[PDB]
Amino acid sequence: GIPTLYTPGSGQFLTTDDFQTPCMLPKFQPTPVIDIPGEVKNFLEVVQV
Amino acid sequence: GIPTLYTPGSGQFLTTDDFQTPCMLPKFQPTPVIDIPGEVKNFLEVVQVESLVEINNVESAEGVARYRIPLNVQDAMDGQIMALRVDPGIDGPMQSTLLGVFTRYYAQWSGSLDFTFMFCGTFMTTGKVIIAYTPPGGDQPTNRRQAMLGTHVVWDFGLQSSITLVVPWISSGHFRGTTLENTIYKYRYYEAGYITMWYQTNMVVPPNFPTTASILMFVAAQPNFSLRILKDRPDISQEGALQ
Amino acid sequence: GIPTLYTPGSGQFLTTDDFQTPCMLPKFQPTPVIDIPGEVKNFLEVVQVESLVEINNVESAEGVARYRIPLNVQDAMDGQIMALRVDPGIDGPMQSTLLGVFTRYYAQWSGSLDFTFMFCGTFMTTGKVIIAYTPPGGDQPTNRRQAMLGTHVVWDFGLQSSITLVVPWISSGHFRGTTLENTIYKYRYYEAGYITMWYQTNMVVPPNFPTTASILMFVAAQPNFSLRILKDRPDISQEGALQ
Amino acid sequence: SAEACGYSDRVAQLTLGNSTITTQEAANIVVGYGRWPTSLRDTDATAVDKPTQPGVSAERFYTLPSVQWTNSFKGHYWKLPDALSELGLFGQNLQFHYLYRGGWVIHVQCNATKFHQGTLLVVATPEHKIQSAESPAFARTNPGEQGAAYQFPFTFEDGTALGNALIYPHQWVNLRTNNSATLVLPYVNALPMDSGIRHNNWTLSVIPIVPLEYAAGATTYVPITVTIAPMCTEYNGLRAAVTQ
Amino acid sequence: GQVIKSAVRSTVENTVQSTHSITTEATPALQAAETGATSNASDESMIETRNVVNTHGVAETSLEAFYGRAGLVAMFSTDGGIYRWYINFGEYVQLRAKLELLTYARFDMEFTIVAQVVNAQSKVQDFNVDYQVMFVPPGASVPENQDSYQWQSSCNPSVISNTGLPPARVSVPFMSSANAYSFSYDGYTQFGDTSGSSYGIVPSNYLGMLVVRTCEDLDGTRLRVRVYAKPKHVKGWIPRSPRMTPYKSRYTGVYTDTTKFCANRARITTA
Amino acid sequence: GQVIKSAVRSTVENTVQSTHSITTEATPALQAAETGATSNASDESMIETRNVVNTHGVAETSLEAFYGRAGLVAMFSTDGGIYRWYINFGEYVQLRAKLELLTYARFDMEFTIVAQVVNAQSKVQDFNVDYQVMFVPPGASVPENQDSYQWQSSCNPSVISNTGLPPARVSVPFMSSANAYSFSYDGYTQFGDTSGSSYGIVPSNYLGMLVVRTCEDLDGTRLRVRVYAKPKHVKGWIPRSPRMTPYKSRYTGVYTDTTKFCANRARITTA
Amino acid sequence: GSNIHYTNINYYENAASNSLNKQDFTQDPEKFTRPVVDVMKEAAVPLK
Amino acid sequence: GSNIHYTNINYYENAASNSLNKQDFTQDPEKFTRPVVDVMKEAAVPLK
Amino acid sequence: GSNIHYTNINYYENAASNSLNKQDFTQDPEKFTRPVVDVMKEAAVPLK
Numbered sequence A: 001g002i003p004t005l006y007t008p009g010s011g012q013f014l015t016t017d018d019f020q021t022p023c024m025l026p027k028f029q030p031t032p033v034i035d036i037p038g039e040v041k042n043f044l045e046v047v048q049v
Numbered sequence B, C: 001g002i003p004t005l006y007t008p009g010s011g012q013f014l015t016t017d018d019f020q021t022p023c024m025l026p027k028f029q030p031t032p033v034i035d036i037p038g039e040v041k042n043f044l045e046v047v048q049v050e051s052l053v054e055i056n057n058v059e060s061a062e063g064v065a066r067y068r069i070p071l072n073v074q075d076a077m078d079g080q081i082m083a084l085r086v087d088p089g090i091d092g093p094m095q096s097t098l099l100g101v102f103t104r105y106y107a108q109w110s111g112s113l114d115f116t117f118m119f120c121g122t123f124m125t126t127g128k129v130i131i132a133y134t135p136p137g138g139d140q141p142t143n144r145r146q147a148m149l150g151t152h153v154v155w156d157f158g159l160q161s162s163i164t165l166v167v168p169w170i171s172s173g174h175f176r177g178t179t180l181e182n183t184i185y186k187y188r189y190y191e192a193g194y195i196t197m198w199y200q201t202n203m204v205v206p207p208n209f210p211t212t213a214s215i216l217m218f219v220a221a222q223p224n225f226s227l228r229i230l231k232d233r234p235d236i237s238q239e240g241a242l243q
Numbered sequence D: 001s002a003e004a005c006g007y008s009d010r011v012a013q014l015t016l017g018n019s020t021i022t023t024q025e026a027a028n029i030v031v032g033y034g035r036w037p038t039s040l041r042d043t044d045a046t047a048v049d050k051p052t053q054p055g056v057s058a059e060r061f062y063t064l065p066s067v068q069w070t071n072s073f074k075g076h077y078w079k080l081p082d083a084l085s086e087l088g089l090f091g092q093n094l095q096f097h098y099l100y101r102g103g104w105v106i107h108v109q110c111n112a113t114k115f116h117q118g119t120l121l122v123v124a125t126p127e128h129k130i131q132s133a134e135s136p137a138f139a140r141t142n143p144g145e146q147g148a149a150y151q152f153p154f155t156f157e158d159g160t161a162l163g164n165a166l167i168y169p170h171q172w173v174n175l176r177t178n179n180s181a182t183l184v185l186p187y188v189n190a191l192p193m194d195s196g197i198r199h200n201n202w203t204l205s206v207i208p209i210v211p212l213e214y215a216a217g218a219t220t221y222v223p224i225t226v227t228i229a230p231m232c233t234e235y236n237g238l239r240a241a242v243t244q
Numbered sequence E, F: 001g002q003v004i005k006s007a008v009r010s011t012v013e014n015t016v017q018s019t020h021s022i023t024t025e026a027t028p029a030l031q032a033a034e035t036g037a038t039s040n041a042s043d044e045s046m047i048e049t050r051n052v053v054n055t056h057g058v059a060e061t062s063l064e065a066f067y068g069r070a071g072l073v074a075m076f077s078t079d080g081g082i083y084r085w086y087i088n089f090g091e092y093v094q095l096r097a098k099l100e101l102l103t104y105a106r107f108d109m110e111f112t113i114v115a116q117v118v119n120a121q122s123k124v125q126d127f128n129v130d131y132q133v134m135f136v137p138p139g140a141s142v143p144e145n146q147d148s149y150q151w152q153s154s155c156n157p158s159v160i161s162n163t164g165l166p167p168a169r170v171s172v173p174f175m176s177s178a179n180a181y182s183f184s185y186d187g188y189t190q191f192g193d194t195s196g197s198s199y200g201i202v203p204s205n206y207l208g209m210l211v212v213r214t215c216e217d218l219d220g221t222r223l224r225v226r227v228y229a230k231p232k233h234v235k236g237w238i239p240r241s242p243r244m245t246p247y248k249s250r251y252t253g254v255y256t257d258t259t260k261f262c263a264n265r266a267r268i269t270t271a
Numbered sequence G, H, I: 001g002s003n004i005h006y007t008n009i010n011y012y013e014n015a016a017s018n019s020l021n022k023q024d025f026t027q028d029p030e031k032f033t034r035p036v037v038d039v040m041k042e043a044a045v046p047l048k
């Protein structure tokens, strides 16, 4: 095994964390993205209304 | 999974550790860095700035008066004016200076020191004084003759109000401990020596002039000065929660 | 996170482990390496230096006298002078030598040995002695005739005061255990043999000269000597906290 | 020639707007942090309105009421821009705008004679807090053009050592040497601009460290005068006049 | 308008050999502190020096090296299973005094949380329990109880860990609305108010509070928590005169006057 | 001024075949120890040898291989929840004797800390507790109690771990003010004092102390601590005569005189 | 001292997550030690 | 014995953090075994 | 802000396992703010 040293923070659950994790359905294939009007990418688009 | 073997130290919290960690706000975008005068990148920039030595630390001197080295018209020759250990990190006149405060945030120091003095008597008040640095080995010099055998400068009061005595770095080792605490560590080993001042001639004044005057004492690190091993400043403490 | 699987050994503290770990002072900058004479990189450099064998380890010999091999004018021929097992790591005359101390810090050894002897009688005192190395198999030789059948050197006392008997590495295996402890490990298996000294002729002196003289015995590892498997030196111990 | 010989001439002239200040006993000129005042860069600015830049109407020397170097004098201080908040068009522009930005040119004056001795520390301190009291009085945090007397000089009114105030832009008026100090100060803050009626960026202090003494019979009445000029100023957020 | 340059260096200055000097021209020793400038007399000009190739570094005094380590900023015990800590660094003096050495500074921070269970007599317990630390920015609702709805924390960042796991740790960016944090502010917190309690504090330095709870109720015991902070990527401006008097209040720099800093000695002529 | 070269080798010397020699010229066996030089008689010159391509290495006797492993340097139990250990390697003899084999040496060190809880009768407990090890350099204030302000450790380095986690471990650089540590010093600790207690100790070898505490109070139990040290990146100078007498004091090399090192045998003629 | 070779890869999105800066140099202190308009050379007298 | 191939990347800033040195050679011991001014060849007598 | 350099390797088979998207830009809001057929320039009156 590759020698490692685990650090502070290990095991913690930070709600804003951003890691990759195993998928419950690794081979799942979602429905296609269809053309729907009104796509919004950022809420600044909304507050300017 | 990749085979791994975790090692000693795992889970520990070393205050000086330096790892990368998840950010609470991964997409946060800080305000721009604007142009602000006085940027400092290293505290060596600060200790090289001269600040006043609380040299007259005696019972009769309170507050501001403690910065003044007393000088007066003599009626005898070769007399002494002041004395001080040059060590920047030990308790005493140096501890409240810029140089002293930062030196007290570290365990070791090295470098030449700039001790500058400014005469503050009247324009008509003259005088010559000798300021000497005595490298270690014995006790502070007992008289002017002994003192002048060391590194020194003879200062003549005049238009240029100040003089600089450089206490050059003269040490067996490349660094010295910042404390001279003896009972436990025997650090008296590191004593850097003494700086003493004596009348070279005499302070002389016209009729009815003040027969006493003052000299202000400044100190700073030279360009070859550095500090190592950060430590908590002993002057900052608390006995309980703050109001 | 990258999938991982931690393995046996995880969390253990092996004293001989060799991992990288966070530094307490990540930005610390040490003093420069200066020129100092006598740098040593490997202790083989030390064991190759000759040191005195505490050869006369008998009740009647105390302190400094234990380094002297007694020699005296004989009134009989072919007599014995001394004997010793050549093993560098076993208890005995070799244990306090440089070679012995380091050999005792290891479990195995290999290599030829340098045994040098210096005669210390008067300039007028003559003599010839034979020093022999008996490879293992039996007991130490009982007489000079048996001893001379092995590796040996005939030494003639003269201007060049010393002689060297090389105990060449002659072993079944490439290495030998450093102890000959038998009760538990049966290491007597490794015995390296014996070194014995005998009068080849006789020690001869002029009228009224001291009829006794001394020989000092030196030992060191040869250039083909090495040690393996570090172990704690059995001579260093303590029964409690030190004052 | 001062430049050729590598020294600083003891005479100086400071001219801004319709005002000219001269001294024949200066000790060089300090430029805080080696930086002259500068306009707000487009890349640092945040307030979007076109600023007002009054020019000479506000960038000129304003002389404040003098202070006496009394026998018990502990020192005196003035907050900036507070001290000039009600003087000339600088004061008006400061009052009529929410935001203000600017540098300064300070000239402290104190002449005596070659028969007098005394030494004043003249220091310009950024963000200088008057915090010796549990609840600081507005009269002391914002003393106005009259300035306020020091009560705790040794601790610099803020719990630090007076002797270390030298880390801030400063000069000394040592009577045997000079009779004035001059300091050029750039705008300093953690923001591009700020309110001139809620925040004082700098504090000018004149503190006696060596008491005033003199040959018996000499003039005993020795004033200290402060003359300050705003420099490179700009204002944003115009509205009616508002003072603190 | 910067007239003074600031070249960078990675080692202190060398010493070059010098010889005697007998002249009326060069007078390095003569100075004038009145100018506000620190003496420029060099070692080589005051005495005869030798050559010294000085390789001493300057790393440990850099802002990053000086500030770049963790220091205690908060310490408390839950009450009713909860505790509300207003984020400020004036409670514990060591880190506080360090920060006040600069007027303005930008830096990210690494927060490390060490927690354990203690009983009513403040005796530590070997008890593993899940705890939650929620960052509540100003304007967001602060939970009143250990089980209030705010703990859902759908927007507020929260970190949930266990006293049986290593200390929790998260980094935070430079969050001030200003372009740098201020460790000295000669002004008031608002317009229209000049009360002493509103002086010397810059509101932008306060980013909110940390509310802590145990996910479920402890039986008779409490959660003890220590919060450490480590500045990172420090940029600083305008060095300040160091604190020279004891701190007395968490929110103000008020102090007790003194007539001396260092202790007295018998006489100025005896070192 | 180095007249003697030091070529490097990675294996011991080979043996080359040799033949008989009957001459008045070459006399390899004749020596003279008075010169101070060790004999230069080679195996091949004393007997007829065969060729031996000897590939035996020399690695395990290098300074790195000899010193490069952990050894106990401190062992203690807290009292009142705290313990102050002055950093020195004279308490436990094994590592001490190793270091004294060199006069001067530079090396970094890896410190490993193993701790566990024990009761009043010194019986080990299965109890996980957080502990703090703070390095206090000389001149810094040493905490008097388990809850003193110095534990804030804003500048002093500290390592906080748990008896339930693996041993703590940190590396330290070559910290002496000198250019090498000294394991033998024939001098005094200060000028103006020639008392015996100030002899044979070089102060620069003492870098401070380690103060240990449990973050919160244990109930009737104590923290047992062992500190191990492992030299790394060793550079050494001037080999010394090995210790040949028992150690008696932690700070001095004082010893009890003896008339023999090895035990006696019946006679010099019987191996 | 510092290693001439060592890994420096960022695993996180925001710079705030990065380890400490590794510059640590110092700069000429003149802006603090000699913030004056007129140059006063070491070999000359300060004022004339 | 030692591997002819193995990873040697430093993860930390300071050299003190690095694993043990991997040289381990020995040098000619003459500075300790024969620190003499005059060369005394093996085939000759030491003194004359 | 965000690092200009950071590792972005996917360890899992399905895209659902991937970390958060790192675009975060905004788009012209006209589809919401001005969803009209006739352009009404800022400098002109809206209706005539």
Ligand SMILES: CCCCCCCCCCCCCCCCCC(=O)O
Pocket (backbone or CB within 6 Å): B024, E087, E088, E089, E090, E109, E111, E133, E134, E135, E157, E158, E159, E170, E172, E175, E181, E182, E205, E206, E207, E208, E210
């Ligand atoms: C959910 C994770 C919790 C971690 C804690 C996040 C804290 C966020 C606040 C960061 C602000 C720190 C800078 C404050 C500096 C000013 C201090 C002062 O002046 O007293």
Ligand SMILES: CCCCCCCCCCCCCCCCCC(=O)O
Pocket (backbone or CB within 6 Å): C024, F087, F088, F089, F090, F109, F111, F133, F134, F135, F157, F158, F159, F170, F172, F175, F181, F182, F205, F206, F207, F208, F210
């Ligand atoms: C916070 C982490 C704690 C780890 C321990 C740090 C210890 C720092 C001190 C290092 C100095 C070691 C060298 C001493 C060698 C001299 C010994 C002696 O002569 O007795």
Ligand SMILES: N[C@@H](CCC(=O)N[C@@H](CS)C(=O)NCC(=O)O)C(=O)O
Pocket (backbone or CB within 6 Å): B238, B239, B240, B241, E072, E075, E092, E226, F146, F147, F148, F149, F150, F151, F152
């Ligand atoms: N004894 C009380 C008070 C202890 C306390 O607040 N100590 C302060 C200094 S007065 C501190 O900084 N402690 C550091 C620490 O315990 O980590 C307790 O433990 O609750």
Ligand SMILES: N[C@@H](CCC(=O)N[C@@H](CS)C(=O)NCC(=O)O)C(=O)O
Pocket (backbone or CB within 6 Å): C238, C239, C240, C241, F072, F075, F092, F226
């Ligand atoms: N029995 C006592 C004293 C034991 C002790 O100090 N032992 C010394 C040797 S005399 C030691 O080196 N112990 C090594 C260890 O326990 O790790 C105790 O356990 O407190």
Ligand SMILES: [K+]
Pocket (backbone or CB within 6 Å): D053, D054, D055
């Ligand atoms: K204009």
Ligand SMILES: [K+]
Pocket (backbone or CB within 6 Å): E011, E012, E013, E014, E053, E054, E055
């Ligand atoms: K250099």
Ligand SMILES: [K+]
Pocket (backbone or CB within 6 Å): E027, E028, E029, E030, E031, G041, G042, G043, G044, G045, G046
């Ligand atoms: K000069």
Ligand SMILES: [K+]
Pocket (backbone or CB within 6 Å): B114, B220, B221, B222, E038, E039, E040, E041
């Ligand atoms: K200087």
Ligand SMILES: [K+]
Pocket (backbone or CB within 6 Å): F011, F012, F013, F014, F053, F054, F055
């Ligand atoms: K070979």
Ligand SMILES: [K+]
Pocket (backbone or CB within 6 Å): F027, F028, F029, F030, F031, H041, H042, H043, H044, H045, H046
């Ligand atoms: K020979």
Ligand SMILES: [K+]
Pocket (backbone or CB within 6 Å): C114, C220, C221, C222, F038, F039, F040, F041
């Ligand atoms: K030999």
